[PDB]
Write a protein that holds these residues in place. Structure first.
Motif, PDB file in Angstrom:
ATOM      1  N   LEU A  54      39.653  -9.074  -7.090  1.00 12.30           N
ATOM      2  CA  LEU A  54      40.660  -9.587  -8.193  1.00 12.30           C
ATOM      3  C   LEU A  54      40.548  -8.622  -9.448  1.00 12.30           C
ATOM      4  N   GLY A  55      41.746  -8.103  -9.628  1.00 15.34           N
ATOM      5  CA  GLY A  55      41.700  -7.507 -11.301  1.00 15.34           C
ATOM      6  C   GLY A  55      43.127  -7.847 -11.810  1.00 15.34           C
ATOM      7  N   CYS A  56      43.051  -8.213 -13.149  1.00 19.36           N
ATOM      8  CA  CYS A  56      44.316  -8.724 -13.775  1.00 19.36           C
ATOM      9  C   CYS A  56      44.642  -8.076 -15.172  1.00 19.36           C
ATOM     10  N   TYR A  57      45.723  -8.154 -15.865  1.00 21.83           N
ATOM     11  CA  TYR A  57      45.867  -7.771 -17.078  1.00 21.83           C
ATOM     12  C   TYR A  57      47.000  -8.579 -17.765  1.00 21.83           C
TER      13      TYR A  57
ATOM     14  N   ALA B 144      39.475 -24.900   5.437  1.00 19.90           N
ATOM     15  CA  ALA B 144      39.501 -23.143   5.746  1.00 19.90           C
ATOM     16  C   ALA B 144      37.964 -23.139   6.151  1.00 19.90           C
ATOM     17  N   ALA B 145      37.605 -22.574   7.424  1.00 21.55           N
ATOM     18  CA  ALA B 145      36.529 -22.229   8.197  1.00 21.55           C
ATOM     19  C   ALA B 145      35.703 -21.135   7.555  1.00 21.55           C
ATOM     20  N   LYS B 146      36.425 -20.107   6.687  1.00 17.68           N
ATOM     21  CA  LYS B 146      35.718 -19.100   6.346  1.00 17.68           C
ATOM     22  C   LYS B 146      36.407 -18.574   4.877  1.00 17.68           C
ATOM     23  N   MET B 147      36.601 -19.117   4.007  1.00 16.53           N
ATOM     24  CA  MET B 147      37.369 -18.787   2.844  1.00 16.53           C
ATOM     25  C   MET B 147      36.360 -17.801   2.158  1.00 16.53           C
ATOM     26  N   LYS B 148      36.482 -16.735   1.825  1.00 11.49           N
ATOM     27  CA  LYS B 148      35.818 -15.951   1.017  1.00 11.49           C
ATOM     28  C   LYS B 148      35.782 -15.818  -0.555  1.00 11.49           C
ATOM     29  N   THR B 149      34.662 -15.877  -1.127  1.00  7.61           N
ATOM     30  CA  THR B 149      34.591 -16.029  -2.642  1.00  7.61           C
ATOM     31  C   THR B 149      35.184 -14.441  -3.248  1.00  7.61           C
ATOM     32  N   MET B 150      35.900 -14.459  -4.378  1.00  8.17           N
ATOM     33  CA  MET B 150      36.544 -13.397  -5.299  1.00  8.17           C
ATOM     34  C   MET B 150      35.411 -13.007  -5.939  1.00  8.17           C
ATOM     35  N   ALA B 151      35.358 -11.766  -6.049  1.00 11.09           N
ATOM     36  CA  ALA B 151      34.796 -10.908  -7.230  1.00 11.09           C
ATOM     37  C   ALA B 151      35.762  -9.987  -8.239  1.00 11.09           C
ATOM     38  N   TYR B 152      35.558 -10.186  -9.208  1.00 12.15           N
ATOM     39  CA  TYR B 152      36.458  -9.242 -10.288  1.00 12.15           C
ATOM     40  C   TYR B 152      36.314  -7.839 -10.069  1.00 12.15           C
ATOM     41  N   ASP B 153      37.256  -6.893 -10.234  1.00  9.63           N
ATOM     42  CA  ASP B 153      37.000  -5.824  -9.849  1.00  9.63           C
ATOM     43  C   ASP B 153      37.683  -4.929 -11.196  1.00  9.63           C
ATOM     44  N   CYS B 154      37.002  -4.088 -11.811  1.00  8.50           N
ATOM     45  CA  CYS B 154      37.675  -3.261 -13.069  1.00  8.50           C
ATOM     46  C   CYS B 154      38.657  -2.214 -12.352  1.00  8.50           C
ATOM     47  N   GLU B 155      38.451  -1.507 -11.332  1.00  8.94           N
ATOM     48  CA  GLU B 155      39.694  -0.640 -10.793  1.00  8.94           C
ATOM     49  C   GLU B 155      41.080  -1.300 -10.336  1.00  8.94           C
ATOM     50  N   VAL B 156      40.683  -2.440  -9.985  1.00 12.03           N
ATOM     51  CA  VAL B 156      42.153  -3.346  -9.600  1.00 12.03           C
ATOM     52  C   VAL B 156      42.770  -3.738 -10.912  1.00 12.03           C
ATOM     53  N   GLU B 157      41.917  -3.867 -11.804  1.00  8.31           N
ATOM     54  CA  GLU B 157      42.558  -4.434 -13.178  1.00  8.31           C
ATOM     55  C   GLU B 157      43.179  -3.441 -13.779  1.00  8.31           C
ATOM     56  N   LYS B 158      42.660  -2.086 -13.465  1.00 11.82           N
ATOM     57  CA  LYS B 158      43.355  -0.681 -14.014  1.00 11.82           C
ATOM     58  C   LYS B 158      44.633  -0.516 -13.587  1.00 11.82           C
ATOM     59  N   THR B 159      44.997  -0.774 -12.083  1.00 15.92           N
ATOM     60  CA  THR B 159      46.306  -0.728 -11.511  1.00 15.92           C
ATOM     61  C   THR B 159      47.292  -1.806 -12.054  1.00 15.92           C
ATOM     62  N   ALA B 160      46.449  -3.207 -12.255  1.00 16.47           N
ATOM     63  CA  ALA B 160      47.241  -4.127 -12.642  1.00 16.47           C
ATOM     64  C   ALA B 160      47.882  -4.034 -14.050  1.00 16.47           C
ATOM     65  N   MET B 161      46.880  -3.322 -14.797  1.00 20.62           N
ATOM     66  CA  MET B 161      47.219  -2.635 -16.076  1.00 20.62           C
ATOM     67  C   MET B 161      48.443  -1.709 -16.099  1.00 20.62           C
ATOM     68  N   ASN B 162      48.435  -0.951 -15.134  1.00 16.44           N
ATOM     69  CA  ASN B 162      49.578   0.165 -14.978  1.00 16.44           C
ATOM     70  C   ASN B 162      50.989  -0.509 -14.957  1.00 16.44           C
ATOM     71  N   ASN B 163      50.996  -1.754 -14.381  1.00 12.91           N
ATOM     72  CA  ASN B 163      51.973  -2.418 -14.196  1.00 12.91           C
ATOM     73  C   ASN B 163      52.323  -2.996 -15.454  1.00 12.91           C
ATOM     74  N   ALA B 164      51.350  -4.067 -16.025  1.00 11.93           N
ATOM     75  CA  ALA B 164      51.679  -5.010 -17.254  1.00 11.93           C
ATOM     76  C   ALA B 164      52.272  -4.003 -18.627  1.00 11.93           C
ATOM     77  N   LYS B 165      51.452  -2.799 -18.483  1.00 12.71           N
ATOM     78  CA  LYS B 165      51.925  -2.020 -19.758  1.00 12.71           C
ATOM     79  C   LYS B 165      53.266  -1.459 -19.956  1.00 12.71           C
ATOM     80  N   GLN B 166      53.997  -1.797 -18.677  1.00 10.54           N
ATOM     81  CA  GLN B 166      55.252  -1.111 -18.752  1.00 10.54           C
ATOM     82  C   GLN B 166      56.386  -2.307 -19.365  1.00 10.54           C
ATOM     83  N   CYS B 167      55.780  -3.278 -19.540  1.00  9.34           N
ATOM     84  CA  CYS B 167      56.652  -4.448 -19.845  1.00  9.34           C
ATOM     85  C   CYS B 167      58.087  -4.772 -19.305  1.00  9.34           C
ATOM     86  N   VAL B 168      57.995  -4.439 -17.903  1.00  9.61           N
ATOM     87  CA  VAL B 168      59.263  -4.761 -17.124  1.00  9.61           C
ATOM     88  C   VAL B 168      58.683  -5.957 -16.088  1.00  9.61           C
TER      89      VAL B 168
END
Ligand SMILES: [Zn+2]
Length: 190
Positions: free
Chosen positions: A141-144, A42-66
């Protein structure tokens, strides 16, 4: 940086390091492809950073447990990978590791090949988790990890969203060759 919201700093760290390390392996030409040989460099693969707001929307999925992808409107402008394991009480950093391996393993198991344009034939092959992890332009990147009654449920979200139909997963060529800001040891652009 992120809230005391049930997610551990250990799991956040594991998610981010796992993504960047595996993006690096792809970028350097070191990732085995089940289509034959290795994923292209890959010519220009970018580094990821952790994002607490992305985490918040991932959490809104995870917390429903479906076990379900969220609608785009519940994660505006974001991509999404989901994973479950039947071990409900799994340590959250272990669950980050297992989910990241599962998603990335699409490349070795199913195959991608040398053509990285994201066509419907490609998407249907079942590699859309791997392509989102190594999507060049995705930099946040944000995850839960949620313990549900019957599963450990892991959601990661990705900004900007990957897996755009018709676009390349990443631009091919020598690591750092289209980067002015390069980590030449990882082959990642900063
Ligand atoms: Zn999916």
């Amino acid at each position: 940086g992120c809230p005391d919201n049930g997610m551990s700093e250990e799991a956040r760290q594991k998610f981010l390091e796992m993504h960047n390390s595996l993006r690096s392996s792809v970028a350097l030409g070191q990732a085995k492809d089940g289509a034959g040989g290795n994923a292209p460099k890959a010519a220009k693969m970018k580094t990821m950073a952790y994002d607490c707001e992305v985490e918040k929307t991932a959490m809104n999925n995870a917390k429903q447990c479906v076990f379900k992808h969220s609608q785009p409107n519940q994660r505006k402008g974001l991509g999404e990978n989901i994973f479950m394991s039947s071990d409900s009480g799994m340590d959250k950093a272990k669950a980050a590791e297992q989910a990241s391996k599962a998603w990335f393993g699409e490349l070795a198991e199913k195959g991608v090949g040398q053509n990285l344009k994201l066509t419907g034939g490609l998407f249907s092959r079942g590699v859309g988790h791997y392509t989102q992890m190594v999507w060049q332009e995705t930099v946040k990147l944000g995850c839960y990890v949620e313990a549900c009654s019957n599963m450990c449920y892991v959601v990661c979200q990705y900004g900007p969203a990957g897996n755009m139909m018709g676009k390349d997963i990443y631009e091919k060529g020598e690591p750092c060759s289209k980067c002015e800001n390069c980590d030449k040891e990882k082959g990642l652009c900063s």
